[PDB]
Amino acid sequence: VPSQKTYQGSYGFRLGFLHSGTAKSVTCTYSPALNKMFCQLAKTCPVQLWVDSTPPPGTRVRAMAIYKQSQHMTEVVRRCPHHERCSDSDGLAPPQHLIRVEGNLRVEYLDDRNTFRHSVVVPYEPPEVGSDCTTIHYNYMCNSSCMGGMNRRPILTIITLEDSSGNLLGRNSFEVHVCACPGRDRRTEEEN
Amino acid sequence: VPSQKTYQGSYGFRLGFLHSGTAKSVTCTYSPALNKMFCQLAKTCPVQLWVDSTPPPGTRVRAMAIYKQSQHMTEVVRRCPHHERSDGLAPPQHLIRVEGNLRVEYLDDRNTFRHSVVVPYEPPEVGSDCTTIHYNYMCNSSCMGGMNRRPILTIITLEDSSGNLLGRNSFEVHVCACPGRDRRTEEEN
Amino acid sequence: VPSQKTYQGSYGFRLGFLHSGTAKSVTCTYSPALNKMFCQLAKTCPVQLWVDSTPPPGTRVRAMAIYKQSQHMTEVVRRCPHHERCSDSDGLAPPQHLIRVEGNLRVEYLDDRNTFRHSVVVPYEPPEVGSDCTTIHYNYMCNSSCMGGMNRRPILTIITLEDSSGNLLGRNSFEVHVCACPGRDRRTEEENL
Amino acid sequence: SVPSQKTYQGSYGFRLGFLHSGTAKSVTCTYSPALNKMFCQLAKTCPVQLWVDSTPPPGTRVRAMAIYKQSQHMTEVVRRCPHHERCSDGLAPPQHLIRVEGNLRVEYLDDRNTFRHSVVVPYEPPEVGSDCTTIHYNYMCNSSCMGGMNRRPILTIITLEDSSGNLLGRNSFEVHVCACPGRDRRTEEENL
Ligand SMILES: *C[C@H]1C(=O)C2CCN1CC2
Ligand SMILES: *C[C@H]1C(=O)C2CCN1CC2
Ligand SMILES: [Zn+2]
Ligand SMILES: [Zn+2]
Ligand SMILES: [Zn+2]
Ligand SMILES: [Zn+2]
């Protein structure tokens, strides 16, 4: 089972999210109280990278899903059978992978030859001028409800920072729920 | 610039404030003469919602700061970079927080870049006749590279669960060392 | 496990440090209360050598690190796999060594054949004309937060004065913390006391 | 380029107070209101009171530094004589004239650029009961120390600063370090 232990490490690595609120129209909204991202099928989910010091050119950013509940943690998070067999592929992403990256021509996907887990990796780039963080636009390609994929089981997204040689630099995670109305779900789940 | 114009609307929405006086020791005090709240950095600022009739379940209460001077009214009110650089829930750039409400929600406007903080409207307790919220102001009015002595207003909106405006009120805010003394002196002129 | 016992010996060997303070910007700062140096990755850490009389010609100054905690002490302190990667930088320093000396073209580095410990040695040279101590510029080449290296574990630098044959003439010791903002971390850690 | 001695109450009404100790033969430390002048013994406790109209925030710091009073000596750094300066309490540099007794959070600075000594402690508010914050300063040479101050008068400058080192308050007082404070105080007042 992949580690989900938070380490900031040498570059002071942590995640941030837009302060998007819960109006009906929002595409994607993070809940600080729940450390949980609410997003829509195949839509833009911006995840921010914040660092105290600049990892060198060659550094890479990996995303992997895992089931949160301990009785499922061993099972590979993958797309439901309906969504594997869509004409929805961008040509770079394997059709079985839940997590894509949008708008990055240097994206790399991995089926682990040993554990069989899926992941998606992009080069690390520093913040643009007049920004203080690096944004990756993720896409989740199934609904939390999909019969036979996740099937309403909670997942975590693990984000790892790694150097050009595979050495781990830092790690963070957040829960994610993929739904029709992210605004609505976040407001409701918070009222507990 | 966002709408600042007062309206009690359908539910009879008004703001009320504790009658705290100007003793040396007061945390926060309101001047009804000035419609101005004097308060201390990061400290409890009580604000009372008053309604003639009860809003529905899902009513939200939003607070936003704006510069009172017309030459600064289009500049976004934010924390100075000193104070920006922290309760886990608030963005470190936001001036106004809510204390004591684990359902608080913060907004960075995608197109205006204005900051606001919102909470569910809850009706008054059995024994209360109003709804209180604890605001905190997280910069001093004097903070260099922030407010920088420019006066602000707090706009308080009542909105329904779909974001339709139901009511709006506003007060000036001065964040200072000794609110007691600042209110008495300003009342003298 | 290397001896860390203080030893002034025949020449009255002691360590001093700059009185640098804790302002936000400072590159390096020593807490007298914590016998702890706070410093930045690959930046200058000045360590002063103070003697009562001048060691003999051919005298030498060694620096070695050990983990402080009892259950890490017999492990060798080294750079993380991330930072040990060969760089266009050094050319004198082995890429595994945590501790370098800067601005000294006679530096020597040692991987001990028996203990595998790392260390870095320079000739001892007396105080420059006028001045009362001898400054060495150490650089520490991983952060204390490096995953796979020190990994948030605490370390001491042991400083030894030795003769030309390697016999102990004196010893001193200090704790080291390698972080982004030494001034902020010293002031925060002292706010305990 | 000489530190400023200009009194500056600034934003919080920064004042100094001192004890009303009189001139009895046995006094270790006595302040002259007429002369704005402290009289004190080598290495003994010198209480100095911080008075404010508003409480400055935590992170506020209190610094002390000596300068020479006369203007042909003002660029010279005030330091201990070579006799006194010999190696101490183990928090204070041995060259430093001014120390703080009874504070494990004391910090000592040799300025990289001006070469000036100073000692700084956190500002604490007064006791929930008391009207002022006391610091116990100790002066570590006599005014008469051949090699150091060498009978030249000095001033102690007390500055209130923020966490970032920006100036909140400044006040100063002359200091004469002597064997018999009460006698030196009454003799110097004698002329008025
Ligand atoms: C980088 C690598 C090399 O190629 C030599 C210099 C240092 N390191 C080992 C030998
Ligand atoms: C000033 C005088 C005193 O009162 C005692 C200490 C020093 N001197 C002699 C005795
Ligand atoms: Zn699906
Ligand atoms: Zn501020
Ligand atoms: Zn490292
Ligand atoms: Zn002296």
Tab-separated table of N, CA, C and O in Angstrom, chain C residues 19-108:
chain	number	residue	atom	x	y	z
C	19	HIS	N	28.086	36.873	17.136
C	19	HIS	CA	26.874	37.303	17.889
C	19	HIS	C	25.868	37.873	16.904
C	19	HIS	O	25.640	39.089	16.937
C	20	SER	N	25.283	37.014	16.058
C	20	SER	CA	24.568	37.398	14.818
C	20	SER	C	23.129	37.849	15.058
C	20	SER	O	22.604	38.553	14.189
C	21	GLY	N	22.481	37.362	16.082
C	21	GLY	CA	21.092	37.797	16.329
C	21	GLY	C	20.139	36.908	15.543
C	21	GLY	O	20.628	36.001	14.962
C	22	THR	N	18.830	37.195	15.588
C	22	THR	CA	17.732	36.414	14.994
C	22	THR	C	16.878	37.229	14.010
C	22	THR	O	15.750	36.816	13.796
C	23	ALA	N	17.357	38.303	13.387
C	23	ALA	CA	16.564	39.026	12.362
C	23	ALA	C	16.276	38.055	11.221
C	23	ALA	O	17.109	37.147	10.994
C	24	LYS	N	15.104	38.227	10.574
C	24	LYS	CA	14.508	37.386	9.497
C	24	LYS	C	15.565	36.941	8.494
C	24	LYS	O	15.618	35.769	8.211
C	25	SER	N	16.347	37.874	7.973
C	25	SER	CA	17.318	37.693	6.862
C	25	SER	C	18.555	36.861	7.250
C	25	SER	O	19.227	36.413	6.306
C	26	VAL	N	18.949	36.729	8.537
C	26	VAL	CA	20.345	36.296	8.912
C	26	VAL	C	20.622	34.919	8.294
C	26	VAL	O	19.771	34.034	8.471
C	27	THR	N	21.786	34.713	7.661
C	27	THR	CA	22.121	33.426	7.003
C	27	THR	C	22.467	32.338	8.023
C	27	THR	O	22.246	31.170	7.688
C	28	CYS	N	22.902	32.695	9.230
C	28	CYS	CA	23.508	31.772	10.221
C	28	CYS	C	23.469	32.410	11.617
C	28	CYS	O	23.916	33.593	11.754
C	29	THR	N	23.071	31.649	12.648
C	29	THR	CA	22.991	32.211	14.016
C	29	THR	C	23.096	31.102	15.064
C	29	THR	O	22.493	30.012	14.893
C	30	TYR	N	23.888	31.358	16.102
C	30	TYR	CA	24.147	30.400	17.208
C	30	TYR	C	23.345	30.816	18.453
C	30	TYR	O	23.465	31.970	18.941
C	31	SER	N	22.590	29.900	19.044
C	31	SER	CA	21.887	30.152	20.329
C	31	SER	C	22.827	29.783	21.455
C	31	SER	O	23.181	28.613	21.536
C	32	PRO	N	23.351	30.717	22.303
C	32	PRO	CA	24.224	30.283	23.397
C	32	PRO	C	23.464	29.366	24.378
C	32	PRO	O	24.105	28.476	24.932
C	33	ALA	N	22.153	29.632	24.590
C	33	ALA	CA	21.263	28.883	25.502
C	33	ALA	C	21.157	27.433	25.034
C	33	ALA	O	21.084	26.584	25.890
C	34	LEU	N	21.125	27.159	23.723
C	34	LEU	CA	20.872	25.780	23.227
C	34	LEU	C	22.155	25.104	22.751
C	34	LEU	O	22.018	23.996	22.302
C	35	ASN	N	23.329	25.734	22.858
C	35	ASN	CA	24.580	25.268	22.199
C	35	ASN	C	24.229	24.729	20.815
C	35	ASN	O	24.686	23.665	20.467
C	36	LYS	N	23.440	25.497	20.074
C	36	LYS	CA	22.935	25.093	18.761
C	36	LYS	C	23.191	26.150	17.698
C	36	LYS	O	22.742	27.272	17.866
C	37	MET	N	23.808	25.731	16.593
C	37	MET	CA	23.929	26.544	15.371
C	37	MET	C	22.696	26.326	14.490
C	37	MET	O	22.310	25.173	14.244
C	38	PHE	N	22.133	27.433	14.020
C	38	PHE	CA	21.086	27.539	12.988
C	38	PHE	C	21.702	28.065	11.685
C	38	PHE	O	22.207	29.174	11.662
C	39	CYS	N	21.580	27.327	10.592
C	39	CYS	CA	22.200	27.768	9.317
C	39	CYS	C	21.392	27.328	8.079
C	39	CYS	O	20.402	26.624	8.215
C	40	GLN	N	21.805	27.779	6.899
C	40	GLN	CA	21.098	27.578	5.615
C	40	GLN	C	21.914	26.594	4.777
C	40	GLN	O	23.193	26.626	4.837
C	41	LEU	N	21.184	25.812	3.977
C	41	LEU	CA	21.758	24.874	2.991
C	41	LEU	C	22.864	25.527	2.163
C	41	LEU	O	22.637	26.549	1.556
C	42	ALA	N	24.060	24.926	2.130
C	42	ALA	CA	25.185	25.354	1.269
C	42	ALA	C	25.621	26.808	1.587
C	42	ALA	O	26.470	27.332	0.877
C	43	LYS	N	25.186	27.421	2.674
C	43	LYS	CA	25.676	28.782	2.997
C	43	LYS	C	26.747	28.688	4.102
C	43	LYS	O	26.707	27.782	4.907
C	44	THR	N	27.622	29.667	4.110
C	44	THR	CA	28.672	29.945	5.092
C	44	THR	C	28.215	29.815	6.548
C	44	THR	O	27.280	30.523	6.968
C	45	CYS	N	28.829	28.898	7.293
C	45	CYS	CA	28.731	28.802	8.760
C	45	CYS	C	30.112	29.041	9.321
C	45	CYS	O	30.997	28.204	9.201
C	46	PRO	N	30.330	30.240	9.858
C	46	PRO	CA	31.594	30.545	10.505
C	46	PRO	C	31.698	29.912	11.886
C	46	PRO	O	30.837	30.141	12.775
C	47	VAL	N	32.796	29.188	12.092
C	47	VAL	CA	33.178	28.634	13.430
C	47	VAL	C	34.583	29.164	13.771
C	47	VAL	O	35.573	29.034	12.916
C	48	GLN	N	34.698	29.756	14.974
C	48	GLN	CA	35.913	30.383	15.462
C	48	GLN	C	36.691	29.369	16.290
C	48	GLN	O	36.115	28.715	17.198
C	49	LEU	N	37.999	29.330	16.067
C	49	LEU	CA	38.870	28.573	16.983
C	49	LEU	C	39.641	29.577	17.854
C	49	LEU	O	40.261	30.502	17.299
C	50	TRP	N	39.614	29.347	19.154
C	50	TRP	CA	40.238	30.195	20.179
C	50	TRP	C	41.291	29.343	20.915
C	50	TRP	O	40.903	28.329	21.532
C	51	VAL	N	42.557	29.763	20.931
C	51	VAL	CA	43.641	29.034	21.663
C	51	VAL	C	44.343	30.017	22.607
C	51	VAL	O	44.204	31.264	22.393
C	52	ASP	N	44.948	29.467	23.667
C	52	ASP	CA	45.753	30.193	24.693
C	52	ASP	C	47.193	30.286	24.179
C	52	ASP	O	47.891	31.261	24.478
C	53	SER	N	47.672	29.281	23.455
C	53	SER	CA	48.957	29.455	22.749
C	53	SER	C	48.994	28.531	21.558
C	53	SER	O	48.154	27.654	21.444
C	54	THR	N	49.882	28.871	20.654
C	54	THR	CA	49.723	28.596	19.222
C	54	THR	C	50.147	27.161	19.057
C	54	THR	O	51.162	26.764	19.608
C	55	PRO	N	49.276	26.293	18.521
C	55	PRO	CA	49.678	24.910	18.333
C	55	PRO	C	50.934	24.811	17.472
C	55	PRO	O	51.405	25.775	16.881
C	56	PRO	N	51.583	23.650	17.433
C	56	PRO	CA	52.742	23.555	16.568
C	56	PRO	C	52.405	23.630	15.069
C	56	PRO	O	51.300	23.309	14.623
C	57	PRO	N	53.404	23.995	14.231
C	57	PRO	CA	53.261	23.908	12.784
C	57	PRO	C	52.856	22.474	12.415
C	57	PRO	O	53.495	21.502	12.932
C	58	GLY	N	51.833	22.347	11.549
C	58	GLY	CA	51.446	21.039	10.981
C	58	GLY	C	50.241	20.515	11.716
C	58	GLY	O	49.705	19.464	11.349
C	59	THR	N	49.825	21.290	12.704
C	59	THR	CA	48.550	21.110	13.405
C	59	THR	C	47.381	21.198	12.396
C	59	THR	O	47.429	22.033	11.433
C	60	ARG	N	46.320	20.435	12.675
C	60	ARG	CA	45.178	20.183	11.764
C	60	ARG	C	43.859	20.232	12.512
C	60	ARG	O	43.857	19.916	13.738
C	61	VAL	N	42.814	20.691	11.802
C	61	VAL	CA	41.441	20.948	12.324
C	61	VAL	C	40.394	20.058	11.564
C	61	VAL	O	40.120	20.324	10.411
C	62	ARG	N	39.829	19.059	12.233
C	62	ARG	CA	38.809	18.111	11.711
C	62	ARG	C	37.411	18.508	12.233
C	62	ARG	O	37.319	19.016	13.381
C	63	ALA	N	36.392	18.290	11.419
C	63	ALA	CA	34.936	18.423	11.647
C	63	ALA	C	34.256	17.140	11.188
C	63	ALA	O	34.579	16.607	10.095
C	64	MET	N	33.425	16.575	12.031
C	64	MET	CA	32.662	15.305	11.770
C	64	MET	C	31.271	15.512	12.374
C	64	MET	O	31.188	16.176	13.444
C	65	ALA	N	30.229	14.953	11.800
C	65	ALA	CA	28.876	14.969	12.391
C	65	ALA	C	28.495	13.573	12.905
C	65	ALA	O	28.995	12.576	12.396
C	66	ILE	N	27.718	13.515	13.983
C	66	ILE	CA	27.090	12.281	14.551
C	66	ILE	C	25.628	12.649	14.839
C	66	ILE	O	25.382	13.852	15.133
C	67	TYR	N	24.695	11.702	14.738
C	67	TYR	CA	23.329	11.892	15.309
C	67	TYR	C	23.392	11.992	16.844
C	67	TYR	O	24.189	11.328	17.581
C	68	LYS	N	22.569	12.914	17.334
C	68	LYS	CA	22.439	13.185	18.777
C	68	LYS	C	21.666	12.035	19.456
C	68	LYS	O	22.176	11.446	20.448
C	69	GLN	N	20.484	11.687	18.941
C	69	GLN	CA	19.618	10.685	19.623
C	69	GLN	C	20.364	9.345	19.702
C	69	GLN	O	21.034	8.971	18.686
C	70	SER	N	20.263	8.669	20.853
C	70	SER	CA	20.898	7.364	21.200
C	70	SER	C	20.607	6.272	20.165
C	70	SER	O	21.494	5.440	19.913
C	71	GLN	N	19.391	6.231	19.620
C	71	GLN	CA	18.962	5.131	18.702
C	71	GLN	C	19.307	5.472	17.240
C	71	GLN	O	18.888	4.690	16.355
C	72	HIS	N	20.061	6.549	16.982
C	72	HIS	CA	20.583	6.866	15.636
C	72	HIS	C	22.100	7.039	15.678
C	72	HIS	O	22.668	7.290	14.614
C	73	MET	N	22.758	6.833	16.813
C	73	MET	CA	24.137	7.357	16.984
C	73	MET	C	25.124	6.552	16.138
C	73	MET	O	26.037	7.185	15.592
C	74	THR	N	24.949	5.233	15.981
C	74	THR	CA	25.946	4.368	15.267
C	74	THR	C	25.765	4.422	13.747
C	74	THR	O	26.607	3.809	13.070
C	75	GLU	N	24.709	5.068	13.244
C	75	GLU	CA	24.510	5.346	11.794
C	75	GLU	C	25.471	6.486	11.361
C	75	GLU	O	25.835	7.474	12.199
C	76	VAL	N	25.913	6.423	10.104
C	76	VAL	CA	26.834	7.440	9.543
C	76	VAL	C	25.958	8.578	9.044
C	76	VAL	O	25.026	8.317	8.262
C	77	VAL	N	26.306	9.795	9.422
C	77	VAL	CA	25.635	11.018	8.922
C	77	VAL	C	26.130	11.280	7.507
C	77	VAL	O	27.332	11.515	7.275
C	78	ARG	N	25.199	11.336	6.589
C	78	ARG	CA	25.523	11.546	5.177
C	78	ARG	C	24.388	12.346	4.581
C	78	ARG	O	23.355	12.545	5.268
C	79	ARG	N	24.671	12.868	3.393
C	79	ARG	CA	23.678	13.525	2.533
C	79	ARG	C	22.625	12.515	2.084
C	79	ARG	O	22.963	11.288	1.917
C	80	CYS	N	21.400	13.025	1.882
C	80	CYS	CA	20.289	12.284	1.244
C	80	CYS	C	20.635	11.855	-0.186
C	80	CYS	O	21.537	12.405	-0.819
C	81	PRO	N	19.945	10.817	-0.727
C	81	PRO	CA	20.119	10.388	-2.116
C	81	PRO	C	19.840	11.508	-3.134
C	81	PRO	O	20.591	11.650	-4.102
C	82	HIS	N	18.817	12.324	-2.849
C	82	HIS	CA	18.497	13.541	-3.628
C	82	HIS	C	19.713	14.479	-3.732
C	82	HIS	O	20.082	14.907	-4.825
C	83	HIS	N	20.306	14.814	-2.614
C	83	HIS	CA	21.405	15.828	-2.557
C	83	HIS	C	22.749	15.183	-2.859
C	83	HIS	O	23.577	15.878	-3.435
C	84	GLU	N	22.939	13.899	-2.574
C	84	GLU	CA	24.261	13.285	-2.862
C	84	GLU	C	24.510	13.209	-4.366
C	84	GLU	O	25.676	13.038	-4.719
C	85	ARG	N	23.489	13.337	-5.233
C	85	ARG	CA	23.715	13.339	-6.705
C	85	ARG	C	24.826	14.327	-7.077
C	85	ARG	O	24.803	15.514	-6.622
C	86	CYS	N	25.803	13.828	-7.844
C	86	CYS	CA	26.950	14.589	-8.410
C	86	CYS	C	26.458	15.905	-9.013
C	86	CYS	O	25.497	15.880	-9.822
C	87	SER	N	27.134	16.997	-8.671
C	87	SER	CA	26.804	18.323	-9.225
C	87	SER	C	28.083	18.920	-9.811
C	87	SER	O	29.193	18.558	-9.316
C	88	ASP	N	27.920	19.789	-10.815
C	88	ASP	CA	28.990	20.663	-11.372
C	88	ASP	C	29.698	21.372	-10.204
C	88	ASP	O	30.792	21.877	-10.430
C	89	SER	N	29.072	21.423	-9.008
C	89	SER	CA	29.609	22.065	-7.769
C	89	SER	C	30.505	21.124	-6.920
C	89	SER	O	30.390	19.887	-6.925
C	90	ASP	N	31.376	21.736	-6.146
C	90	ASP	CA	32.513	21.113	-5.414
C	90	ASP	C	33.680	20.928	-6.361
C	90	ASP	O	34.402	21.906	-6.640
C	91	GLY	N	33.951	19.683	-6.729
C	91	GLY	CA	35.247	19.335	-7.323
C	91	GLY	C	36.324	19.154	-6.274
C	91	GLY	O	37.403	18.580	-6.645
C	92	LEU	N	36.156	19.643	-5.031
C	92	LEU	CA	37.066	19.132	-3.976
C	92	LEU	C	36.288	18.149	-3.116
C	92	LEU	O	36.929	17.175	-2.618
C	93	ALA	N	35.005	18.433	-2.873
C	93	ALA	CA	34.217	17.731	-1.844
C	93	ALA	C	33.663	16.417	-2.400
C	93	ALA	O	33.224	16.375	-3.550
C	94	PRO	N	33.656	15.294	-1.632
C	94	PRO	CA	32.937	14.113	-2.043
C	94	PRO	C	31.454	14.447	-2.019
C	94	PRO	O	31.035	15.133	-1.081
C	95	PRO	N	30.638	13.992	-2.983
C	95	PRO	CA	29.235	14.390	-3.002
C	95	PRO	C	28.386	13.788	-1.860
C	95	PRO	O	27.276	14.275	-1.560
C	96	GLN	N	28.894	12.803	-1.123
C	96	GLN	CA	28.119	12.215	0.000
C	96	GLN	C	28.296	13.023	1.287
C	96	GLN	O	27.465	12.860	2.235
C	97	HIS	N	29.372	13.817	1.380
C	97	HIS	CA	29.721	14.474	2.678
C	97	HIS	C	28.695	15.545	2.977
C	97	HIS	O	28.535	16.446	2.185
C	98	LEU	N	28.098	15.491	4.144
C	98	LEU	CA	27.323	16.631	4.696
C	98	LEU	C	28.162	17.914	4.894
C	98	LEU	O	27.643	19.029	4.587
C	99	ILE	N	29.352	17.794	5.467
C	99	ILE	CA	30.145	18.980	5.886
C	99	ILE	C	31.244	19.269	4.875
C	99	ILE	O	32.142	18.438	4.740
C	100	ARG	N	31.192	20.458	4.258
C	100	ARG	CA	32.338	21.006	3.518
C	100	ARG	C	32.971	22.191	4.230
C	100	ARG	O	32.351	22.781	5.114
C	101	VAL	N	34.249	22.422	3.930
C	101	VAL	CA	34.901	23.733	4.144
C	101	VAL	C	34.970	24.516	2.853
C	101	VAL	O	35.295	23.971	1.814
C	102	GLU	N	34.523	25.742	2.940
C	102	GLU	CA	34.573	26.741	1.852
C	102	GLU	C	35.817	27.636	1.989
C	102	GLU	O	36.218	27.888	3.142
C	103	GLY	N	36.405	28.063	0.858
C	103	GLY	CA	37.447	29.099	0.755
C	103	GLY	C	38.766	28.615	1.298
C	103	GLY	O	39.557	29.432	1.824
C	104	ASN	N	39.046	27.315	1.186
C	104	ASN	CA	40.334	26.753	1.660
C	104	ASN	C	40.836	25.734	0.631
C	104	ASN	O	40.365	24.612	0.622
C	105	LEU	N	41.835	26.103	-0.152
C	105	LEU	CA	42.361	25.219	-1.231
C	105	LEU	C	43.194	24.056	-0.652
C	105	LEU	O	43.465	23.154	-1.426
C	106	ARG	N	43.454	23.980	0.665
C	106	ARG	CA	44.139	22.807	1.263
C	106	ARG	C	43.227	21.842	2.014
C	106	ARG	O	43.729	20.901	2.644
C	107	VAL	N	41.926	21.936	1.863
C	107	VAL	CA	40.957	21.015	2.535
C	107	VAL	C	41.252	19.560	2.135
C	107	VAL	O	41.628	19.282	0.981
C	108	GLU	N	41.057	18.666	3.073
C	108	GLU	CA	41.169	17.219	2.826
C	108	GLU	C	39.861	16.557	3.311
C	108	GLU	O	39.321	16.905	4.359
